[model samples]
Target: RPRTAFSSEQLARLKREFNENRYLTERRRQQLSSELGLNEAQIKIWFQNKRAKI
Candidate 1:
């Protein structure tokens, strides 16, 4: 996968959301994907990787 650095604002939002809840339903992932200008799959993978990191 090509690496893309997240913008500061986007990173902040994602981190804030992640800190709030690591697990998200499909619907919630979709919602966040739209809001954060990312794909649902990206959010899913992000959570998966984050959990693995923890």
Candidate 2:
């Protein structure tokens, strides 16, 4: 898969959301997908990788 670079602002937004909620509920994931213009699976995987990091 091609890796897409996230802009600093985008990263900041995602980081803020992640800090607020380590785990995202299904509804929240869907909401984030639409808000971030990313797929739900991508957000899910991001959360998974993030949790593994801690």
Give the lowest summed-lDDT range of ten residues in model 2: 1-10
lDDT of 1 by residue, 1-54 (tens): 543466788779878888999898888898988898887777777778888998
For candidate 2, the TM-score is: 0.80
lDDT of each: 0.81, 0.81
Give the clashing residue pairs of candidate 1, or none. Answer: none
Off by over 4 Å in 2: 1-5
